[PDB]
Subunit: 106 residues, 3 copies
Amino acid sequence: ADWEDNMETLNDNLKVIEKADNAAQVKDALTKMRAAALDAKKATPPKLEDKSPASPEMIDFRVGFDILLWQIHDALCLANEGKVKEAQAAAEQLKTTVNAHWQKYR
Amino acid sequence: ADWEDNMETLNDNLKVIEKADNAAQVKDALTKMRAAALDAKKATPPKLEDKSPASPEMIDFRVGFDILLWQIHDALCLANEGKVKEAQAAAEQLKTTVNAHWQKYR
Amino acid sequence: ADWEDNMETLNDNLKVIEKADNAAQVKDALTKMRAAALDAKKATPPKLEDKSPASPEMIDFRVGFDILLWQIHDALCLANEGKVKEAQAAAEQLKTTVNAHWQKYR
Ligand SMILES: [Bi+3]
Ligand SMILES: [Cl-]
Ligand code: NA
Ligand code: NA
């Protein structure tokens, strides 16, 4: 895959979380999002393909994926506590972050 | 924000945690600390401005913020479980680590 | 402590987790594992000693610690919740990750 496909996986699992019926489904979707966010952190997005891997721009990109990963980590804790609705609330902020990253790096 | 301002945010919120009366205040302060540590990962302390962004020294700096982030996450999980006093002890350890990073890079 | 020392610490604490009977023992071993993994993340492993610090190889090396750390903390949250055997299974997965990293970069 690639960065774009990782972003598509993030969006798909956000859609799954929105429609989820139980904590197991939210946990599964958030786990998939965690894996996808890491994989995207290892990629180079289209806008930064003219920048070096250790440029400040790419370092900041990887930190942005760290931010997304921490939002996922905390939402996953909230889901493992069984609070499905609050985990969906946190997934809303997840959606905001993912959209901003898509607009910034595509 | 620059590195010093992020460290100041960390210390202000440590003070907030020290004097908190409920889990909500602790959680708010810890969320602010997480945001500040992540933002500081994108900064450069003044004495490392001549180093390359991926130099061993800058790697040590960013990973120090990773250390802080996992300690913040511990305190946040404790707060989520209602364990305010354990979260405050964890925040005392966090204050020690923030001080050590400050002394190391200033 | 160099990278190899950190790997040996991770392996030792995995052995500790395997034979633990209570959650406090598991939590202690996992805390030590987090410390060792974050120490290793800032290192240059033996196989990559001839590579630039800005090389994509070192970036991938560091990003590979994201998985290790989030698996450590999956196990640690399970241990904080008192699920000893579940934490031990999570630590088995973590052991897979640790040994793969060790043998990849030595
Ligand atoms: Bi937790
Ligand atoms: Cl880097
Ligand atoms: Na609980
Ligand atoms: Na027994």
